[PDB]
From Swiss-Prot:
Taxonomic source organism: Rauvolfia serpentina (Serpentine wood)
Family: Belongs to the AB hydrolase superfamily.
Active site per UniProt: 78, 207, 235
EC number, UniProt record: 3.1.1.78
Record key words, sorted: Alkaloid metabolism, Hydrolase, Serine esterase
Entry-linked InterPro entries: AB_hydrolase_1, AB_hydrolase_fold, MES/HNL
Catalysed reaction, written as an equation: polyneuridine aldehyde + H2O = 16-epivellosimine + methanol + CO2
Pathway the protein takes part in: Alkaloid biosynthesis; ajmaline biosynthesis
Protein origin, superkingdom: Eukaryota
SUPFAM superfamilies named in the record: alpha/beta-Hydrolases
Protein name: Polyneuridine aldehyde esterase
Function: Hydrolase involved in the biosynthesis of ajmaline-type monoterpenoid indole alkaloids (MIAs) natural products, important plant-derived pharmaceuticals used in the therapy of heart disorders. Catalyzes the hydrolysis of polyneuridine aldehyde into epi-vellosimine, precursor of vomilenine, an intermediate chemical in the biosynthesis of ajmaline.
Domain AB hydrolase-1: 3-113
Length: 254
């Protein structure tokens, strides 16, 4: 038995893991799927969350409650990788392996905004399609909020998923933030902390929102201890290939 803590990306929520949580449990493991602040059915509203630590606070509540005797495996995807990073900085010893599936993997050597800068470098400005962006917070120093466009979701996140999974996410997706202006002010991670945590990576070769060539770039520039691939996972591998993410994760963790 291991304890997996599962962390969703932006605009999503704990619900994305609904297909993978049973699977890990039927193999005999403990699973936690967290909702981050203003995501899923978390009661907070976006415009009351201005920092990324505030956003990541329900993950941090989980990590503080890992008994002294225990460790967890973390799985994050997309923007979830950033929360994995804070978890890994603050509680390095409570994590046996941090697993990043088609996620940005922070590097103690750069500002926390660096994977975002590199994404703008490597991807076109129209990458998010019908998604839409607006400022919130103080007009004097603003946040950016985003909503996922229906086409963006169908073509570029859930394209190897059932229309059912696509429909559920339209019902459940909420405005998100990538916290860029706050992340630009956050303390960097260190190698003594963040950097002491074994890391794994799971490629999702068919992720059109985060192309594999760019996922491959985080492993080449930061490194990972283990690395797997899902030939047919899209951005939502946990929904499109839930049995393969399970298999990868038991491999990585055993
Ligand atoms: C919530 C929709 C998004 C679209 N896109 C955006 C933001 C999110 C999503 C992950 O949740 C991916 C992957 C990603 C994005 N920006 C990145 C920067 C560095 C590495 C990966 C990314």
């Amino acid at each position: 038995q291991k304890h997996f803590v599962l962390v969703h990306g932006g605009c999503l929520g704990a619900w994305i893991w609904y297909k993978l949580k049973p699977l890990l449990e039927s193999a005999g493991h403990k699973v936690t799927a967290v909702d981050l602040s203003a995501a899923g059915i978390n009661p907070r509203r976006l415009d009351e969350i201005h920092t990324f630590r505030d956003y990541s606070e329900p993950l941090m509540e989980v990590m503080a409650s890992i008994p002294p005797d225990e460790k967890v495996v973390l799985l994050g995807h997309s923007f979830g990788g950033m929360s994995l990073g804070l978890a890994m900085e603050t509680y390095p010893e409570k994590i046996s392996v941090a697993v990043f599936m088609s996620a940005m993997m922070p590097d103690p050597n750069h500002s926390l905004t660096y994977p975002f800068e590199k994404y703008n470098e490597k991807c076109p400005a129209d990458m998010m399609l019908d998604s839409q962006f607006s400022t919130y917070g103080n007009p004097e120093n603003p946040g950016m909020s985003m909503i996922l466009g229906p086409q963006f979701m169908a073509l570029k996140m859930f394209q190897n998923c059932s229309v059912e999974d696509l429909e559920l996410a339209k019902m459940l997706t909420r405005p998100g933030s990538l916290f860029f202006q706050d992340l630009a002010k956050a303390k960097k991670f260190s190698t003594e902390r963040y950097g002491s945590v074994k890391r794994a990576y799971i490629f999702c070769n068919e992720d059109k929102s985060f192309p594999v060539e760019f996922q491959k770039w985080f492993v080449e520039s930061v490194g990972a201890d283990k690395v797997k691939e899902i030939k047919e996972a899209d951005a939502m591998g946990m929904l499109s290939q839930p049995r393969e993410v399970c298999k990868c994760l038991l491999d990585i963790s055993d």
